Amino acid sequence: PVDAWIREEVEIPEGVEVTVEGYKVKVKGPKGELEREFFWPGIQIFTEDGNVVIYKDFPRRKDVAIARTFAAHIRNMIKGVTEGFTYKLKV
RNA sequence: UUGUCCUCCCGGGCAUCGCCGGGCAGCUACGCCGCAGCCGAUAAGGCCUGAAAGCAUCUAAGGCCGAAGCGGCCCCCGAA
Numbered sequence: 001p002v003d004a005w006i007r008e009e010v011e012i013p014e015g016v017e018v019t020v021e022g023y024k025v026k027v028k029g030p031k032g033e034l035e036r037e038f039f040w041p042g043i044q045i046f047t048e049d050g051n052v053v054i055y056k057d058f059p060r061r062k063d064v065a066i067a068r069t070f071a072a073h074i075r076n077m078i079k080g081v082t083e084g085f086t087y088k089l090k091v
Numbered sequence: 092u093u094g095u096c097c098u099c100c101c102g103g104g105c106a107u108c109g110c111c112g113g114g115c116a117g118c119u120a121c122g123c124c125g126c127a128g129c130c131g132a133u134a135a136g137g138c139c140u141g142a143a144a145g146c147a148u149c150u151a152a153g154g155c156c157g158a159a160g161c162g163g164c165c166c167c168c169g170a171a
Contacts, residue, residue, distance in 0.1 A: 040152070065143035066152055072141060073153090 001058040008071040010052040016078055018052055020045055025052070025074060029081030036077065040066045 012018050017028045025045060026035040038045055043056045043066065052074055054067050079085075 038152095061143065062151065065141095067142090068145095069140095069142045069152065076140080 002060060002064065003058075005055065005057045006059040006064055006067050008054040008067050010054075010071055010074050010078065012047075012050045012052065013078070013082060016082060018047060018074075018078075020047055020052075025077075027074070027077045027081050029078075031081055031084055034077050034081060036073065038070045038073070040070070043067060043070070045070070 015030055019026045019028075023039045023045065024035055024037045026033070038054075040063070042059075042063065043054060045052065045054050047053065054070050054074075056063055056067060059067065
């Protein structure tokens with residue numbers, strides 16, 4: 001164990017709604033709605049106040065990496081449902 | 092058609108089917124007819140998202156494509 005516990009928080013903007021039904025996180029916003037299944041043994045995802053919390057007790061290196069990856073993915077979901085993503089290519 | 096025998100003529104036996112030329116049915120090949128490129132997952136390899144490691148990163152979790160090779164379509168045997 002690298003720490004007693006790991007807690008990661010993702011802020012929820014006013015226009016964004018986030019729900020957690022088990023291991024599946026659903027993010028709904030003005031521009032659409034997405035759902036993704038974030039699973040990893042011992043990692044719990046829930047909501048507190050205006051934040052999404054990814055929490056685990058006595059995490060290891062891989063556990064910390066997975067938690068940070070999940071936080072990044074959820075933040076990407078929020079950004080996509082808020083403003084969206086644009087990619088550019090040139091011929 | 093050659094030698095010989097049945098006396099000669101017709102018609103026959105033997106000589107590798109006596110030897111020689113042609114030969115339908117049958118069997119044959121030297122002859123003739125038939126033999127799919129589509130889907131699914133992958134190896135090597137090419138990428139997307141993403142942290143550990145506030146950045147970067149195809150990889151750790153996750154996703155896409157990708158071989159005459161693997162599974163099926165197909166052919167043959169198949170109620171002990």
